[PDB]
């Protein structure tokens, strides 16, 4: 059924699973028209499909041309997401196909179930976790490849860099969710924390800086403080 804090270690067992977040698929800027009405302009988006055990992120870039001439785009976007996840699953060798797909928003359940009828053994599940995957577009290299795309495109990224050489996937997922929650709550500050020190760089083949174990503990502490700080600023505590 639904995924929550009781069955949290299930994410890191040896059953292949993917998270699917559709929150950045249909993206718009709202603006005024010459006549003083309001209109939207779509910008490029992405599906965020992540294996939490391996860090594998299949980032399907959604080019604005897919919306051309279509109506009810917020509804279409869920079905386009489902279509692309289904296409990705079918593209994978059988032994790499997921056993479970967890959607971060319950409105994805029916579209994905319908697109996956051919895969009755793949469980489609919601989650009671509030996962900060919407903040994926705050990762500079992911935002860059989405915005530069001139056509539909699937970009492959390990969202854990090389962390799994030193930490478990539970710890790597916890680090990722803390970083993304911080970027979601105060992007400017979080980025400042991540790059304040110019001697720690991001390798060309990575997303995040090359922190040592000790430095990661410092960074993680600073991100918690940021989240707590914003929580206070928000609620006046």
């Amino acid at each position: 059924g639904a995924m929550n804090s009781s069955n949290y270690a299930e994410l890191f067992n040896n059953d292949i699973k993917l998270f699917v977040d559709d929150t950045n698929v249909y993206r718009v800027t709202v603006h005024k028209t010459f006549e003083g009405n309001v209109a939207t302009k779509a910008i490029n988006g992405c599906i965020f499909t992540l294996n939490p055990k391996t860090g594998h992120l299949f980032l399907k870039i959604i080019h604005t041309s897919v919306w051309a001439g279509q109506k009810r785009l917020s509804q279409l976007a869920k079905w386009k997401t489902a279509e692309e996840v289904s296409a990705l699953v079918r593209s994978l060798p059988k032994e790499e196909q997921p056993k479970q797909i967890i959607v971060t928003r319950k409105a994805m359940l029916d579209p994905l179930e319908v697109h996956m009828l051919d895969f009755p053994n793949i469980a489609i599940r919601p989650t009671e976790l509030r996962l900060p995957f919407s903040a994926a577009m705050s990762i500079d290299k992911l935002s860059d490849v989405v915005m530069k795309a001139t056509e539909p495109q699937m970009v492959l990224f390990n969202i854990y860099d090389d962390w799994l050489d030193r930490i478990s996937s539970y710890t790597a997922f916890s680090r990722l969710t803390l970083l993304l929650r911080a970027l979601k709550t105060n992007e400017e500050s979080a980025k400042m924390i991540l790059l304040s020190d110019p001697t720690i760089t991001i390798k060309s083949y990575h997303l995040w800086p090359s922190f040592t174990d000790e430095q990661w503990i410092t960074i993680e502490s600073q991100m918690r403080d940021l989240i707590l700080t914003e929580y206070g600023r928000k609620y006046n505590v």
């Binding site: 029916d110 579209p111 697109h115």
Partner: protein, 300 residues
């Protein structure tokens, strides 16, 4: 006008005949029901006074044979039987009629209720949903499950309604996932009407039969089936105009007939609110929407 005679009434029982019902006391001199209108299916149903558990009954059509009810004390129920000997059956009915031991089917002349509930219901189609080929009549009770219910357990005692499932490969064309899920017209018109039912009359017949089993037996799987067949129509953007008009009439008489005190269990709030207020056909069921709003405004 035909007759369903009884050998006797050894146990106290409420007897239903179509939408009518009456009480028979233990060992009361009751020999059956006369003046049954020819031309329609009928249902004679039973609820024992000492065990309201298990409503049960028999669908039959007097044009297909001479039927009667005898209590079986071993199996503990009123059973419908066929008498092959025409001569003897007519003489026994004649004697029951001379001794005035029968209740008269109490049809008001103005009253088209039963016709309107059974307009498309045929015995031949009943006998394919209820499989017991050695009999010309069909037994149904409160507890019988449907073929779909069993897939989600005795197959011989099942209600073989047409399986409707909106998230099934049958309902959804590869490559038209969103289209076919949000607009069920393909599933209604090509798969069900053209493919399985052949015409809307057979579809409405199953719909009406499902409602009647839900109402008269409290049969839960029948209620599920009735609501599924309504929803499939209401959720199709493309439905023949004559079907929508006929559906409105069918549902009107079903809602009109439903016992007020059984509305809570026989009517699915989600389906009805969706069908009347959100679906493609939300504005096509004028009569049904008006009786629902005046009779069950709570449900909505």
């Amino acid at each position: 006008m035909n007759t369903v005679p009884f050998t006797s009434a050894p146990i106290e029982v409420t007897i239903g005949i179509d939408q009518y019902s009456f009480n028979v006391k233990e060992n009361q001199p009751f020999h059956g029901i006369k003046d049954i209108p020819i031309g329609h299916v009928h249902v004679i149903h039973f609820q024992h006074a000492d065990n309201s558990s298990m409503r049960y009954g028999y669908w039959f059509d007097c044009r297909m044979g001479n039927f009667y009810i005898q209590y079986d004390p071993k199996d503990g129920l009123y059973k419908m039987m066929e008498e092959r000997d025409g001569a003897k059956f007519e003489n026994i009915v004649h004697n029951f009629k001379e001794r005035q031991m029968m209740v008269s089917y109490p049809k008001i002349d103005e009253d088209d209720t039963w016709y309107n509930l059974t307009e498309f219901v045929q015995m031949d189609k009943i006998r394919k949903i209820v499989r017991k080929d050695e009999n010309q009549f069909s037994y149904v009770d409160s507890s019988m499950t449907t073929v779909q219910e069993n897939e989600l357990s005795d197959p011989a005692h099942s209600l073989n309604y047409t399986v409707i499932n909106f998230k099934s490969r049958e309902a959804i064309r590869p490559g038209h996932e969103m289209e076919d899920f949000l607009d069920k017209s393909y599933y209604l018109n090509t798969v069900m009407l053209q493919g399985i039912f052949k015409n809307s009359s057979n579809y409405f017949g199953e719909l009406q039969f499902a409602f009647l089993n839900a109402m008269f037996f409290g049969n839960y799987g029948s209620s599920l089936q009735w609501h599924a067949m309504i929803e499939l129509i209401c959720s199709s953007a493309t439905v023949p105009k004559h079907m929508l008009d006929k559906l409105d009439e069918i549902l009107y008489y079903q809602i009109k007939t439903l016992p007020e005190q059984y509305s809570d269990i026989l009517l699915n709030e989600r389906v009805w609110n969706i069908c009347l207020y959100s679906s493609f056909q939300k504005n096509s069921l004028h009569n049904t929407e008006k009786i629902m709003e005046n009779k069950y405004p709570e449900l909505l």
